[PDB]
Homo-oligomer: A and B are copies of this chain.
Amino acid sequence: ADAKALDELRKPKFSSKYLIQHVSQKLIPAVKEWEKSYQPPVIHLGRVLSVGDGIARVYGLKSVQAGELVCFDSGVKGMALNLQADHVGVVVFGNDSVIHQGDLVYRTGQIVNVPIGPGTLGRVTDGLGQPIDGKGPLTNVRSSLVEVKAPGIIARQSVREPLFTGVKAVDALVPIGRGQRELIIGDRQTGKTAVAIDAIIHQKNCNEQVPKAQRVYCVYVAVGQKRSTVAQLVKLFTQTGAMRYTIMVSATASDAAPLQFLAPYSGCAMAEYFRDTGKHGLIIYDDLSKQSVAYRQMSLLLRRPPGREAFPGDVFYLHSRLLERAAKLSKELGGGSLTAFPVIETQAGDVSAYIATNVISITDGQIFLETELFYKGIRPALNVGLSVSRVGSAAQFPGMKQVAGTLKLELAQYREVAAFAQFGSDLDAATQYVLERGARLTEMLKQKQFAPIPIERQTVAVYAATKGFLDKVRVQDIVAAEEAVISQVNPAVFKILKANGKITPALDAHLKAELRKVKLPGA
């Protein structure tokens, strides 16, 4: 049974020829009797052996590459994922109902690529690069691969520039950097899309104020969301004007599993154009836990062995090689940046899930949104004891850095006291005082939705709480007391604080002057 006599059979040992000269002149008249049942043989083209659930097993296709775009004869595209010895496993970029057994598969010659450039700036796109907004094809745009390797050690530099988000809980406690990956994680309906959206709106508000090179081009990747939500987001971004700087990559729930798998890579490739051409990009991978689910389906139907919660083994590499493309390049590469905001939905606050722990270990910071802080009025529901950022200093406003340390410390003073709120002994009027300031700080940190704040009006508002100026009011009207503060302090303070970056010693003087000049309605 071993290969040595099996190779000896290649040498002829027939010793008689009373069938060979009989059937060799009988074979070709027999085969010609069935030539309309024969399909033509295939070598460099392909032919579908089996199709089902979005996977085509393709016979032939001798010279395909791994990860290569293929195109079926019915027009629907594909992607040669696992190249096995007798067939190619092709995932279908679309509905696989137009694929039959025996359909011809054509190799396109290209690894999968999307159109990148300034022409995508303003369009609503699918996960493969085609525009779905009904405004014609993509013009002033060029094709680029979706599997670019992330820039290495010598290509990067240290993250210094802020990229404020307009959410003062974020910009005060979890300060983002301009090339930093920050994970927004929480349960369902806890305000993660709200934080990413307010970040995009604040980049629209800041792009009409900075000189042409600190301008931030947002890219929103909607993975697995329904199409009504994406249309509502396009309506929001057009009615506020944020669509002039925003690209939207939309692989919805009706799309195929490889389209939702590939849409964060399409959005990252579209956002890497601004990173590589010296501009600054912002990429939001909304529902990265749905891209992992689409990848799980795509790999389970390719009959790869499942792992934790039936995910692939390489589902860490899926998000690591995606998120590591968010970098801040060196000056010889342009100095451009790309900052990622991946979103993970947890189940009942279980942070110890597989995809959640993987993306926590990948990204720099964390933004935790608890559903018990959400229903206590704290909006955004930032879990201040769990939301971490790697940069801390040297990535926020220098004015905010002087003020938010006394916020970070005193919220920690508030949290270690409030676990003794069943008795109320009010020890030496000190444990009473620190909660009576921390409740003011948590009520200060609340804000509305789709209304981001400039950073100067945030660091004035935390200046009015880390100092005095609000100890005279109840905790029920600080969301109106800070409106009284920003509305009645003279707006020439904000211009000086924006142009300086920190509070000059002539500016904290005038700021302490004008925070008693205002009439706050807190009684």
Chain A interface (Cβ < 8 Å from any Cβ of B): 1-2, 47, 59
> With a CB–CB cut-off of 8 A, which chain B residues contact A47?
2
Q: Would you give the shortest CB distance from A59 to chain B, in whole angstroms?
A: 7
Q: Would you give the shortest CB distance from A254 to chain B, in whole angstroms?
A: 25
3 contacts between A and B (CB under 8 A): A1-B59, A2-B47, A2-B59
> With a CB–CB cut-off of 8 A, which chain B residues contact A2?
47, 59
Cα A174 to Cα B459 in complex, Å, equals 63
Q: Would you give the shortest CB distance from A435 to chain B, in whole angstroms?
A: 27
Q: Would you give the shortest CB distance from A178 to chain B, in whole angstroms?
A: 42
> With a CB–CB cut-off of 8 A, which chain B residues contact A59?
1-2
Q: Would you give the shortest CB distance from A160 to chain B, in whole angstroms?
A: 43
Q: Would you give the shortest CB distance from A102 to chain B, in whole angstroms?
A: 9
Cα A47 to Cα B59 in complex, Å, equals 34
> With a CB–CB cut-off of 8 A, which chain B residues contact A1?
59
Q: Would you give the shortest CB distance from A301 to chain B, in whole angstroms?
A: 15
Q: Would you give the shortest CB distance from A61 to chain B, in whole angstroms?
A: 14
Q: Would you give the shortest CB distance from A187 to chain B, in whole angstroms?
A: 20
Q: Would you give the shortest CB distance from A135 to chain B, in whole angstroms?
A: 46
Q: Would you give the shortest CB distance from A175 to chain B, in whole angstroms?
A: 36
Cα A259 to Cα B59 in complex, Å, equals 46
Q: Would you give the shortest CB distance from A345 to chain B, in whole angstroms?
A: 22
Q: Would you give the shortest CB distance from A132 to chain B, in whole angstroms?
A: 36
Q: Would you give the shortest CB distance from A185 to chain B, in whole angstroms?
A: 26
Closest to A47 in B: B2
Closest to A59 in B: B2
Closest to A3 in B: B102
Closest to A49 in B: B2
Q: Would you give the shortest CB distance from A47 to chain B, in whole angstroms?
A: 7
Sort A-B residue pairs by CB-CB distance and give the 3 closest, nearest first.
A2-B47, A2-B59, A1-B59
Cα A323 to Cα B510 in complex, Å, equals 80
Cα A59 to Cα B59 in complex, Å, equals 32
Q: Would you give the shortest CB distance from A57 to chain B, in whole angstroms?
A: 13
Q: Would you give the shortest CB distance from A105 to chain B, in whole angstroms?
A: 14
Cα A47 to Cα B47 in complex, Å, equals 39
Q: Would you give the shortest CB distance from A414 to chain B, in whole angstroms?
A: 28
